[PDB]
Symmetry: C3
């Protein structure tokens, strides 16, 4: 409770890392409640989202779409230092779905270019939760320009299945999924603009059709493919955290399953098991736990396959290890 | 069980109230099975749904969009007197998703202007359920002109969490979400018509694109905002019933959570907990239970933020009490 | 399981049947693990999908949209012989969402016209699961041309509720839902094409709007209405398996409920109960169990009612038996 007791608590400063990677943390909390501190600089910046050179004026927490994942434990205090540099042109703020009161922090964090703010909240509820910018009058526009990310609030005792048993992951990835609404000119070619402000009226028009032009993981078509593929090994236990701040998605691991999925993203709700494809509503985060059993390339997709393969929502995993013929075997290879 | 047994049961006449309020009722059932009696008159009427004077020909149970919430207990009989006055122009009926047989009651209740009908059914399954009009050949048209609502079938012992702890609400609010399909002319302006029949062909064209022009709560943009804000106090337990007869929604309380959410709306299915954003599929109702911990303004939204902030799907809660600094605090107010 | 052990398992050839019917199987497995063998031939053919004569070039497992349901039990091996006849024009393959490895078997089954393949996998997880075609660089096009179906992997002990009480169905039906994306010319008329590859660029343009032209059960508007309605009696227990390989759906039985719904489709996840409307995400199969209580015509719909009644997603059940006045009665008939 008391502001004096909260001053007595240990501090712990964390350096953030860019998605899909997640900063060092422990699954089981060592010691009692802490004030965990993060800093993020907001950058408005031109990003290129596909191979044609299509451009978006992105509004990015820490310079990335999505914003980085922050990890705390249940009953920690998270303390954010949020900086809007004077080179920015817009007011921004932050709403944590994880937090209680003042529009998730958004009423207390309104910062113009050149301003900074520090917010603290108590992470009372365990799970993965979306955060996003939400300035009055301009909420969808900042969210759909990439201004969103996730936090994970781990239970103090680490993850468990529905019936008590410990689930320890070997590695964790964060896939942030983004719907973009890029205006087209008379000839169906993507438009380009000088400042974010100039794109406003044209983007609102595309938004009102409810149809994105691109749906991407980590900011761009193919950002998580080729040599940017996520990696694992046969027998390795992976947690995939997935968020969508504005629109529904239906993740699917091609060649795999979600062994335990917290599809609502909340760790006091017991996970579904043996999932082929799970569902994360717009404005939520989810998490899926899988142990790889076969080596090779996997694709991780939004299973609206038009959104996956036409709009850009596909990532790769490259998995090393030995093939298991009991699980699957080619009895007769393709032959005439 | 037998007709004679039903004829012996006490009757209870209930006066309906307009959404978002809900008629007087008891959470734990007072005594044994009753025949609960309700009367609704159907009104066809022009409504104005936005601040630009946009009109819809609404087809409204008891004159409101959505129609009123009816509350019974498990194993009561709901006996509905449905009235279609001579001042109306179309045939209407009612399908309760809570009922078993004859298309939810739809096949037994087709009434022309000038007619009435009395339907009785046993409320065998506890939960919140959609009701809606469904005239053969004309089902979606009546549903997206506002002709839908919800009933709540309480367990006789009241609400309980997933492991038997009782859940008593202080307040209950009914939010009905509606997708509308308003035709435009060649110049972008919404069309007006002089009767409901005349809008039919044009509306069907809009409906087939599957893209609503407006998504609203309680019949209009801003219906439940500012001074028509729903009210609670810090410490109050509130039940929010949300329905959508046609299209999916993803409710979120900005600054809050769904402590217990029956996302499917069915009380024999254990609620999800600590929800940030939950999902209600088109054709269903869901309910969220939450204890306010912080005072101030809260927005209640469909978290496709385009639908919420551009299309109309936003309500307010005004909450009184004192601020809890342990839960959230501004460490450094915005500043250069 | 030693190599010797796998090698000596009994084999069983199963003859497939067309949706919405399901091949003969037992709910409780009889005996120990088996290798269950199925054969399917791929057919590219023009089908008529609505009452206006709109045609599509379907890419059809076994000649049907959806593909047939295959039924095995947990820890059975499923061994599929997949044939692509010389008269087809395109390479096809298969990805079982039930299988582990090589893109669900898609990396091992790429067959040109004139070729066959045999894939074997162990069915380790119980549930209903989508299967679909998935050729590299053309995945959505084969899926939305109807090249998808479902399998059911039953628990060895049959279905159970949450409480561990057995659930035994009398009848099972498979409803495959398909989103089609049919191009139109500038007059608003649906286009017709000579060969499947001719339709490609125009179809991808419709696909990118994310708005299907038609949403149908069993390959056409009205396919499961009228004389082809599904049948049951008062007192029968019915399992409805439903799949959608690309797009969300929200099934509803008008006049009925889902007593037990495995909405995610996976039998180790306890079912939801007393459902009005349930939700199956694109890329999944779901299952609903219901005991009919009343006779009459029921409609079974996607409960986006525009998709149901304007785009084609509506089926019928005709149920025989006697009316129960306790459950519902007309006290005063329209007057
Ligand atoms: Cl896939
Ligand atoms: Cl929000
Ligand atoms: Cl319906
Ligand atoms: Cu912003
Ligand atoms: Cu939000
Ligand atoms: Cu009506
Ligand atoms: Cu309905
Ligand atoms: Cu194919
Ligand atoms: Cu798939």
């Amino acid at each position: 409770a008391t502001a004096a007791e909260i001053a007595a608590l240990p501090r712990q400063k964390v350096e953030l890392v860019d998605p899909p990677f997640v900063h060092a943390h422990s699954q089981v909390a060592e010691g009692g409640p802490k004030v965990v501190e993060f800093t993020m600089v907001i950058e408005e910046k031109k990003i290129v989202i596909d191979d044609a050179g299509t451009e978006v004026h992105a509004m990015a927490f820490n310079g990335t779409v999505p914003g980085p994942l922050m990890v705390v434990h249940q009953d920690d205090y998270l303390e954010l230092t949020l900086i809007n540099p004077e080179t920015n042109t817009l007011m921004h703020n932050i709403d944590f779905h994880a937090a209680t009161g003042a529009l998730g922090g958004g009423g207390l964090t309104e910062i113009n270019p050149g301003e900074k703010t520090i917010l603290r909240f108590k992470a009372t509820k365990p799970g993965v939760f979306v955060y996003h910018c939400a300035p009055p009058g301009m909420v969808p526009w900042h969210v759909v320009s990439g201004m969103n990310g996730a936090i994970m609030v781990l239970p103090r005792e680490g993850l468990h299945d529905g019936k008590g048993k410990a689930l320890t992951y070997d590695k964790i990835y964060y896939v942030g999924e983004q719907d973009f609404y890029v205006p087209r000119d008379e000839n169906g070619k993507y438009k380009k603009y000088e400042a974010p402000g100039d794109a406003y009226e044209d983007t609102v028009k595309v938004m009102r059709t409810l149809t994105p032009t691109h749906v991407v993981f980590n900011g761009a078509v193919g950002a998580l493919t080729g040599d940017k593929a996520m990696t694992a090994a046969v027998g390795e236990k992976v947690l995939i955290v997935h968020s969508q701040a504005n629109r529904d998605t239906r993740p699917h691991l091609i060649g795999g399953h979600g062994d335990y999925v917290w599809a609502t993203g909340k760790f006091n709700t017991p996970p579904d098991v043996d999932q082929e494809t799970w569902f994360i509503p717009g404005g939520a985060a989810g998490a899926a736990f899988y142990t790889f059993q076969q080596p090779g390339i996997y694709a991780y997709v939004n299973h609206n396959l038009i959104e996956a393969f036409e709009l850009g929502a596909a990532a790769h995993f490259k998995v090393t290890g030995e093939w298991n013929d009991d699980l699957m075997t080619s009895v007769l290879a393709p032959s005439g």
